[PDB]
Amino acid sequence: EVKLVESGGGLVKPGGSLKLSCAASGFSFRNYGMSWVRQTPEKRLEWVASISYGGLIYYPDSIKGRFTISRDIAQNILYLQMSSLRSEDTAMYHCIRGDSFLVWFTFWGQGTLVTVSAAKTTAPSVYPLAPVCGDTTGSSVTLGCLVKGYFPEPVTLTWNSGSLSSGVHTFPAVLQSDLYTLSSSVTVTSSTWPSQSITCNVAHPASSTQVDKKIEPRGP
Amino acid sequence: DVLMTQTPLSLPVSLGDQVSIFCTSSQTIVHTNGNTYLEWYLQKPGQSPKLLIYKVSNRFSGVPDRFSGSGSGTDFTLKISRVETEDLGIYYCFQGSHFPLAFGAGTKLELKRADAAPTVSIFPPSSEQLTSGGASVVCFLNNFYPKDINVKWKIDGSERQNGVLNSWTDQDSKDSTYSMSSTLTLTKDEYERHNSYTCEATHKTSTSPIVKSFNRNEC
Ligand SMILES: CN1c2ccccc2C(C#N)(C(=O)NCCC(=O)O)c2ccccc21
């Protein structure tokens, strides 16, 4: 059973170095060409480098000089030495086994995440988003939760500890400035809130953070 | 360098539909050995990309008979004769006939459904953030369809294009709609320098933007 498992991914400061590893199984490196392809936050696929069953190595001019692919044929482990790291190098890295002059990326590993950043572990700022008196004149009501300035990703946000599941939208985190910011919105009936309790529960494992914010109606 | 161009970046379909996704190379992609190394990959949400077609038209063993590749010159096409729910995701074309090897931007196979005007909600800064000296004005434009949408901010009547962070959700698995959040981030003092904060949504449903706002002093 062909198997490819990438390791080594992690947080790295710009210009820093990192070595990724890929333990293969079910085949031999002397019989197949191996490659590294990354998927950026934007979901763009980029070829990083490849080494043929015979040892020949290829790189795009963007990676050439900074990244170095090599392989341990005996232990069947593919490697990727990364240096001169920039934020654009932030991506999920996959080793791939292809068929010589047949298919480049026949089989992909699940990948290892590499995150280039200067940011330091920062707990999130969790704020309760209550509606303005104008939006609350209907049969339903939308409440929100702002999880600002955290690092690294991810955080876990729930409503009423997960009790409140439907009609929710937790938006993808974005970089506010080397720090992440995310928000969630939950929509319920006007009789559900403030008539009934609604709390936003946000955790941030990296900082051992677990905060709770109850959404209270605005106004003096 | 050979660049691969994919179209459309989003293909809304109804299940049962026969679809065709395209990929254009900046120039001919025939390896010196005569083969065309054009490959098609499908990445399912939460998973790594998987091979469908190799060398233009060869269906990879284990891939459903409904997928097929074709093309020549600079024009290539991925075909799905009868779309199933499992086919939804993003398809990528790739060329390995010339170095550097190049990927296309991908085409997202998404589901069609009835149009949906977004529900727009605006939220003034919380007193806790204010207390900490900050001021974030959030706005949610939820469950709309199609995904195409424009959000505009107006502070004290004037448009605010600077300092806006937007995020989009993927199509909803239950109602197939889309939602987006837009956060205007200011400072406690900056926020108190104005009174009216407006969030306007332009969807192919309203034209005259859906307008929501509040006054820092009244409601
Ligand atoms: C997978 N594979 C691959 C993987 C890593 C490095 C090189 C290749 C390769 C190329 N070029 C290939 O088969 N190279 C053999 C070495 C040579 O040029 O003699 C090639 C060519 C076409 C399709 C796939 C591949």
In chain B, where are the structural domains located?
1-113, 114-216
- Chain A and chain B share a number of CB contacts under 8 A equal to 142
Torsion angles phi and psi, residue A114, rounded to 5: -110, 125
- Tell me if B38 sits within 8 A of B52, measured CB to CB: no
Q: Is B51 within 8 Å of A106 when comparing Cβ atoms?
A: yes
Where b means 16+ CB within 10 Å and e means fewer, A130-166 reads bbbeebbeeeebbbbbbbbbbbbeebebbbbeeebee
Distance CA B183, CA B167 (A): 9
Q: Is the bond leading into A154 cis (omega within 30 degrees of zero)?
A: yes
Distance from CA of residue A98 to its chain's centroid?
Answer: 26
Single-letter residue type at B107: T
Specify the CATH number of the domain A1-118: 2.60.40.10
Specify the fold of B1-113: Immunoglobulin-like (2.60.40)
Specify the fold of B114-216: Immunoglobulin-like (2.60.40)
Helix (H, G, I), strand (E, B) or coil at A205: helix
Which whole-number Å values give the CA distances from B168 to A103, B52, B199, in the listed order? 35, 28, 16
- H-helix or E-strand spanning residue B191: helix B188-191
Helix (H, G, I), strand (E, B) or coil at A206: helix
B22 DSSP β-pair partners: B7, B77
Q: Which residue of B has its CA nearest to A111?
A: B48
Torsion angles phi and psi, residue A87, rounded to 5: -55, -30
A47 DSSP β-pair partners: A37
Q: Which residue of B has its CA nearest to A110?
A: B48
| A56 close contact with B: CB closer than 8 A | no
- What is the DSSP track for A46-104? EEEEEE-TT--EE--TTTBTTEEEEEETTTTEEEEEE-S--GGG-EEEEEEEEETTTEE
Distance CA B67, CA B53 (A): 8
- Of B174, B169, B199, the closest CA to residue B184 belongs to B199
Specify the fold of A119-217: Immunoglobulin-like (2.60.40)
| B214 close contact with A: CB closer than 8 A | yes
Distance CA B200, CA B211 (A): 5
- Could you tell me whether strands A18-25 and A11-12 are parallel, antiparallel, or unpaired per DSSP bridges? unpaired
- Tell me if B122 sits within 8 A of B214, measured CB to CB: yes
Maximum CA pair distance of chain B?
Answer: 74
Distance from CA of residue A200 to its chain's centroid?
Answer: 22
- What is the DSSP track for B124-142? PPPHHHHHTTEEEEEEEEE
Nearest beta carbon to residue A47 from set B100, B121, B167? B100
Q: Is B175 left (phi over 0), alpha (psi -120 to 50) or beta?
A: alpha
Q: Is A183 within 8 Å of B167 when comparing Cβ atoms?
A: yes
- CA dihedral of B54, B57, B61, B62, whole degrees rounded to 10: 100
Where b means 16+ CB within 10 Å and e means fewer, A38-61 reads bbeeeeebbbbbbbbbeeeebbbe
Q: Is B103 within 8 Å of A44 when comparing Cβ atoms?
A: yes
Which tokens sit at B192? 């108190």
Q: Suggest the residue from B127, B140, B164 to mutate for an interface test with chain A (most A CBs closer than 10 A).
A: B140
- Residue B189 is given by DSSP the state H
Single-letter residue type at B198: T
Give pairs for B46-53: CB < 8 Å, separation 24+: B47/A110, B48/A94, B48/A108, B48/A109, B48/A110, B48/A111, B49/A39, B49/A45, B49/A105, B49/A108, B49/B92, B50/A108, B51/A103, B51/A105, B51/A106, B51/A107, B52/B78, B52/B91, B53/B78
Distance CA A46, CA A43 (A): 10
Fold match between domain B1-113 and domain B114-216: yes
Instruction: Look up tokens 């806006």; give the residue.
Output: B164
Torsion angles phi and psi, residue B42, rounded to 5: -125, 125
- Could you tell me whether strands B10-13 and B107-111 are parallel, antiparallel, or unpaired per DSSP bridges? parallel
- Could you tell me whether strands A112-116 and A11-12 are parallel, antiparallel, or unpaired per DSSP bridges? parallel
- Tell me if B97 sits within 8 A of B29, measured CB to CB: yes
Q: Is the bond leading into B100 cis (omega within 30 degrees of zero)?
A: yes
| B35 close contact with A: CB closer than 8 A | yes
Which tokens sit at B70? 């074709």
- Tell me if B79 sits within 8 A of B20, measured CB to CB: yes
Helices and strands in chain A, H and E counts? 0, 19
Instruction: Look up tokens 């990083």; give the residue.
Output: A48
Ligand 1 contact, A97 CB (< 6 A): no
Numbered ranges of CATH 2.60.40.10 in chain A: 1-118, 119-217
- Tell me if B95 sits within 8 A of B2, measured CB to CB: yes
Q: Suggest the residue from B53, B63, B183, B191 to mutate for an interface test with chain A (most A CBs closer than 10 A).
A: B183
- Residue A30 is given by DSSP the state T
Distance CA A11, CA A114 (A): 6
A67 DSSP β-pair partners: A64, A82
Say how many CA atoms lie within 13 Å of A163 toward its Cβ: 10
Under 8 Å CB-to-CB from B34, ≥6 apart: which residues?
A: none
Which whole-number Å values give the CA distances from B133 to A152, A163, B162, in the listed order? 23, 32, 20
Question: With 0-12 CB in 10 A as exposed, 13-18 as middle and 19+ as buried, what is B158?
Answer: exposed
Ligand 1 contact, A68 CB (< 6 A): no
| B4 close contact with A: CB closer than 8 A | no
A116 DSSP β-pair partners: A12
Distance CA B98, CA B32 (A): 9
Q: Is A104 within 8 Å of B165 when comparing Cβ atoms?
A: no
- H-helix or E-strand spanning residue A145: strand A140-150
Give the nearest ligand 1 atom to B35 CA. Answer: 22
Instruction: Look up tokens 């090897």; give the residue.
Output: B101
| A43 close contact with B: CB closer than 8 A | yes
Q: Is B196 left (phi over 0), alpha (psi -120 to 50) or beta?
A: beta
- Could you tell me whether strands A18-25 and A77-82 are parallel, antiparallel, or unpaired per DSSP bridges? antiparallel
- Tell me if B208 sits within 8 A of B216, measured CB to CB: no
Please say whether the dihedral angle defined by the alpha carbons of residues A52, A57, A62 and A65, taken in this order, is positive or negative: positive
Instruction: Look up tokens 């400061």; give the residue.
Output: A13
Distance CA B161, CA B184 (A): 9
A202 DSSP β-pair partners: A157, A211
Distance CA A54, CA B189 (A): 65
Q: Is B167 within 8 Å of A102 when comparing Cβ atoms?
A: no
Distance from CA of residue A24 to its chain's centroid?
Answer: 24
What technique was this entry resolved by? X-ray
Helix (H, G, I), strand (E, B) or coil at B86: helix
- Of B117, B114, B142, the closest CA to residue B204 belongs to B117
Q: Which residue of A has its CA nearest to B181?
A: A171
Distance CA A80, CA A111 (A): 12
Which tokens sit at B210? 């859906």
Q: Is A129 within 8 Å of B49 when comparing Cβ atoms?
A: no
Which tokens sit at A153? 């990703």
The data reach a resolution, in angstroms, of 2.0
B128: chain A residues, CB-CB within 8 Å: 127-128
Q: Suggest the residue from B4, B121, B169 to mutate for an interface test with chain A (most A CBs closer than 10 A).
A: B121
- Could you tell me whether strands B89-95 and B102-103 are parallel, antiparallel, or unpaired per DSSP bridges? antiparallel
- Tell me if B143 sits within 8 A of B116, measured CB to CB: yes
d(CA B35, ligand 1 centre) in Å: 12
Ligand 1 contact, B51 CB (< 6 A): no
- Tell me if A213 sits within 8 A of A145, measured CB to CB: yes
